[PDB]
Each structure stands twice: as C-alpha cells, then as structure tokens.
Amino acid sequence: SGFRKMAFPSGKVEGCMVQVTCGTTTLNGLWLDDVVYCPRHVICTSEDMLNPNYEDLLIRKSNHNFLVQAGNVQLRVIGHSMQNCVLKLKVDTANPKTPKYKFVRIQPGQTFSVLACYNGSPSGVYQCAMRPNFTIKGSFLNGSCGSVGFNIDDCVSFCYMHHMELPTGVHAGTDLEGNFYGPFVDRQTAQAAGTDTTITVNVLAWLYAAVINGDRWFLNTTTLNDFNLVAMKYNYEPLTQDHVDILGPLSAQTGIAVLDMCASLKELLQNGMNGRTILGSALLEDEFTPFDVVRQCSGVTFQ
Amino acid sequence: SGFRKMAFPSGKVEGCMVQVTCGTTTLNGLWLDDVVYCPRHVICTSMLNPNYEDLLIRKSNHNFLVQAGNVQLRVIGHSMQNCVLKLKVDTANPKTPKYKFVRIQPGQTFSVLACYNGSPSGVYQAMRPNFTIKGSFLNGSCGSVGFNIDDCVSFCYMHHMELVHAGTDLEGNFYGPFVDRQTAQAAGTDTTITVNVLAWLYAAVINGDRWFLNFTTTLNDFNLVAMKYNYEPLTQDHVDILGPLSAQTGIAVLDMCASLKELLQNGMNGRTILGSALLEDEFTPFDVVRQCSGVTF
Ligand SMILES: *C(=O)c1ncc(Br)cc1OCc1ccc(C)c([N+](=O)[O-])c1
Ligand SMILES: *C(=O)c1ncc(Br)cc1OCc1ccc(C)c([N+](=O)[O-])c1
Numbered sequence: 121s122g123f124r125k126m127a128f129p130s131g132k133v134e135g136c137m138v139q140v141t142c143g144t145t146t147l148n149g150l151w152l153d154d155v156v157y158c159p160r161h162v163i164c165t166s167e168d169m170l171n172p173n174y175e176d177l178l179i180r181k182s183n184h185n186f187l188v189q190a191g192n193v194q195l196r197v198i199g200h201s202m203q204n205c206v207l208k209l210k211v212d213t214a215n216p217k218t219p220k221y222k223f224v225r226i227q228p229g230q231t232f233s234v235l236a237c238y239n240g241s242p243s244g245v246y247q248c249a250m251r252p253n254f255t256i257k258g259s260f261l262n263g264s265c266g267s268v269g270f271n272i273d274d275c276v277s278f279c280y281m282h283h284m285e286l287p288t289g290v291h292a293g294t295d296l297e298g299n300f301y302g303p304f305v306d307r308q309t310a311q312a313a314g315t316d317t318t319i320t321v322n323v324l325a326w327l328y329a330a331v332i333n334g335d336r337w338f339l340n341t342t343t344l345n346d347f348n349l350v351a352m353k354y355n356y357e358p359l360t361q362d363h364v365d366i367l368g369p370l371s372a373q374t375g376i377a378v379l380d381m382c383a384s385l386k387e388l389l390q391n392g393m394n395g396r397t398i399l400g401s402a403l404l405e406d407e408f409t410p411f412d413v414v415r416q417c418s419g420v421t422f423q
Numbered sequence: 424s425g426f427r428k429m430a431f432p433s434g435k436v437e438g439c440m441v442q443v444t445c446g447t448t449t450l451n452g453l454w455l456d457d458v459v460y461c462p463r464h465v466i467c468t469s470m471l472n473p474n475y476e477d478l479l480i481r482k483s484n485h486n487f488l489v490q491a492g493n494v495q496l497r498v499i500g501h502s503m504q505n506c507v508l509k510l511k512v513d514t515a516n517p518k519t520p521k522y523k524f525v526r527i528q529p530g531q532t533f534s535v536l537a538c539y540n541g542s543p544s545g546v547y548q549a550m551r552p553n554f555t556i557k558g559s560f561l562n563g564s565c566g567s568v569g570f571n572i573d574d575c576v577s578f579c580y581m582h583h584m585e586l587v588h589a590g591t592d593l594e595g596n597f598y599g600p601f602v603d604r605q606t607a608q609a610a611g612t613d614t615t616i617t618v619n620v621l622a623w624l625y626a627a628v629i630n631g632d633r634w635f636l637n638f639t640t641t642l643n644d645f646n647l648v649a650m651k652y653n654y655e656p657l658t659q660d661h662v663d664i665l666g667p668l669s670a671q672t673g674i675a676v677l678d679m680c681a682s683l684k685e686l687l688q689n690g691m692n693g694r695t696i697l698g699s700a701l702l703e704d705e706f707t708p709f710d711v712v713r714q715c716s717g718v719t720f
Pocket of ligand 1: 145146147161169261262263264265266283284285305306307308309
C-alpha cells in the first residue's frame, strides 16, 4: 500500500555520467558507446552566452579543447560535432558500462526521472513531468546542466538533457538529439514560458491511485463536454477519448467508469478540498501518468 | 532553483539486492561481503503467532535458495540476529560498496529502494516520531532497504511489515514497538517533525517564497503552541542544527518560529509554499543544505 512520487532506479545512468570541460566552462556529459553528449553552451564564455553564434564559436574549437573526465580517467576526444543544441564528442573508448538504451522525445504530460548531477557525479534522483508548456519543475543548480532525464522499460530511454534555469525558477532543456522542448533557445535572454495548464488525464490517474489505496471520500455523473467545459474554466487540459482509453485498465481494476471519475473531479474543482487530503496531498496532483500508477500499484520491476 | 523530495543515487544499493526463497515464501535480501540479510519471516508459512527459533530449527542451509540475477548462491551457514536472518554464502559480493549499518533517529530521513523478487522497482525519500514510515510497499517488498550515502552506504532500514509501514535496522532490531507477527498492532500518535518544517521554511525563503515571513517568540512560547498542534518540541540542539540556515537567509531561528506559529494558528489561507498546500516535515536541515548547495557522491 501507499503511493509516492517514485523515481526509476538510477544505477544504469550513474555509470554514464562524465565531466565535460571546454575552456573554463565545466558541466555534465552522458557517455554512451564512444560518444559523449552535453549541452553545446559548454563552449560559451562569460560574454558569449548573451548572444552566441555557436557555429562560429565551435569553429574556434579543436578536439584538444574538450577535456572529458570519467571518475579519474581522462578520455581522448578524437572528433566533435554539433547536432541542434547538443555537442557530440567522439572519444576513443566505448563506455564499458553502456546500458541498452534508446533516445526518445516525450510528449507533454509524460513523466521521467532526472538524475541531478554536478561535476559529472550523481547528487540525487527525483521524478518529473514535462509540463504542457514544455518546462519542468525540478531542482537544478548552476552546474546541473547536462544532467539527463530517463525512463527504464532493462532498456534506458533517455528523453531529456538539462540546459538552462530560467527566471521564475522554471527549467528547460532538450531531447538527446538537441532539439529543445518548447520555444526556448540556449541564449541568456529573458524567455517566456507561456501559460501552463494542469494535466487532466494525470489527475484522473492519481484519483484512481487514491481509490486503489483506500482514499475514497471524493467518490460521489457528468459528460465529456460538460467536464471539458468545467476543465477549461480551471485551466485543465481538455480530456480526449484517447485519454479515456488510457484510463481503461485503471477503470477495470478499480471498477469505476472513466466518466464517473470525471464527475468526481468536476465536483472537486468547483468546491476545493475543504481541508481534506487525498493521498496526503492538499492539492490535486498531475505528475502521475496512468502508466505510473499501474507500475507502482502492481510492483513492476527492472533489471 | 526549485525544491524536490530527492532520493540518493541508488546504484551502489542496486548491486546488493538478491532474491531469497524458503519454502513458498520469496522476498528480498541484502548481499554484502559473503552474508545475505533478509527478514526472518521468510521462514514463516501461512505467522499468526510464530515461534521463530523452533521454526528455524526445521531449516537447513539447502532450504534457502539465494539468487543474485541468474546466479544461484550456495548457502553454507544461517543464523538469526534479532528479527533478520543472516545467510552465509560461499561467494563475497563483488559489488560490495564501502558500507555501515546504523540506527537512525526519529525525524532523520533516508531513501528506500523498493524491490520485488530481488529486482529494483523504484527509489524515493522520514522515520516518523512514532517509528513508522509512510512509504509505498506492496506484498513482496519485504527485504527492501533504506539507506543514506556519504562513497559509503549507511544502511539504516529493512522493510518487514505493512500494518502504514514498519521494519528494522540491519541488526534486526525493530524501530518502534512492533514485532513480526500478524496481529493488529498500534503505532503511537504520530507527530510533526518541527525542526524539519523549519528547515523547509528556510528552503522556501532560499527559493523566493517569503510571503509567510512575519513578530518573534520564545522557545517556551513556541513550544506551547507546538504542543497544541501535535508538533515535536523544539530544543536548543534543534536550534543549533538550524544555525547554518539562519546565516544564509539572515532570519533568526526564533523569528522563523514566530512565522511557523502564525501559520499554525492561522492556517495557510489557500496559498502554497514550495508548491505544497501543507507544512512539510520530511526534509532535515542536512537535506536542505545538500539540495540547495549541490553536494554529490
Ligand atoms: C546550467 O546549469 C549550467 N551549468 C554549468 C554552466 Br558552466 C553553465 C550553465 O548554464 C549557464 C546558463 C545560464 C543561463 C542560460 C540562459 C543558459 N543557457 O543559455 O542556456 C546557460
Ligand atoms: C512483506 O512485504 C512480505 N513480503 C513477502 C512475503 Br512472502 C511476505 C511478506 O510479509 C507478509 C507479512 C504480512 C503481515 C505481517 C504482519 C508480516 N509480518 O509478520 O511482519 C508479514
């Protein structure tokens, strides 16, 4: 019993963290096979971050300006290229600890674990959602750049690399091909993350988790259009039939129809929680996918 | 920027998890050097009232199947220490980290690697004042362990029972009044970890949330209110442990107690602090500094 924000076991990713140094700039890199991946702004000086011309900046750089550390052993860089916003440093040594892995670009509302890292060494692990506005709400300090986000299915699916801490304390970065999530660019100018919304299908998954664990008081019908008319008023993501189908297997195991749970949530939005808690939270939680809930509640393991 | 309930990196512990079977029962064990550690109720059948030394007498070494991955370990000795079984095996675990066994104190925090059938499921981050923990354990998780890291793993917890959750240190000594038998058992009234909530408010101020800043008070004055609200009383040791946070934020500990007293007596008014609509007590002062200063391992 119980329900917690659970992160994936992080061992397979710990063995892939390295420390990447270019000039005086030092951040984290990801060492898979004979390639190291890090944010391309590792080549930026103090003044260069304000308006970098990365192509011109990287032309001023040869292989020997890139110093890669893995624990103690230096790696020889024998090739460098830029792919979108990530630098790729080919090294002469395949990582012996390379897990089976894939590169993945997730969708708003999906979750993953971040291994927060400084100087190439793991500091901590926690779970995150890709917000609808393509930011993430995490714990990133200067130096955390290059930490990665991942899911595990024995195969590690890397989905996020950390690139930047914005004003308002929001966080942004790229997939592992270097394509930013959201409108952001790797330039130190003020950058607007637009209006966020609440991940509706996730809140519903979490109410199911609440029922599975004996937390039932909010159980109490409505329609998809009626619910969408309420949800839009409270800045909730609209609920599509696809989302109802993703909640199917929770509906089965819990014996509560998707539409009935929407009725319960509609009531919760219009009246708040009156000081009650759900799963020990005083707010409605939207960073659990339906997959997350079934995973935790059916004890899925990895190796 | 930002603040998250953050677990330790779990790699060194992952390498130590094995599956332990005795009869029909299978749960998790911890494999360090040539010794496997697991809850002694692995030997219990369908436990309403077990006599452990009598039940363990009917067991020989070959009655315990220990599997690390696809590899079967050979069991060459077995002994009971308090409520954990210690299975001696013929092979030292190659992946043994530098480690210690420690008994944490109520209010201290740690990470749990939830495990089933010897394989890692997930990691999350307090030992309640009433010696329970509020976790996520399904049937089969028993044997999963709690730990802090310093390159040294401080093993502090082993999971034994879903009542809420309860278990032992790594010498098999239960935290709290519990015993490993399937009778209904009462934990004490649970109370809020006052020094931790304060640490958390310091972290709030560090990240820009200051709306609750307000007045001052006295340790006895505050303690009188903490008592009313089921808070653990604040001692000078607590105040001293919050010292370094007081320096960074420039808010005196006793000034922070006054705001907390206001929050206790006024509620939160529908506002939030670090994204939570409740007061949060599962961050130690150590945790706040580790996260806010990026300590690594
Ligand atoms: C990011 O965490 C980071 N780590 C280490 C270094 Br040396 C530099 C880092 O980023 C600095 C930074 C600051 C602001 C902005 C907007 C960016 N960026 O252009 O993305 C980078
Ligand atoms: C605990 O999680 C567990 N895992 C696997 C098995 Br085969 C058995 C397990 O514990 C069952 C159990 C149930 C209730 C009680 C009170 C105890 N206990 O005596 O501690 C154990």
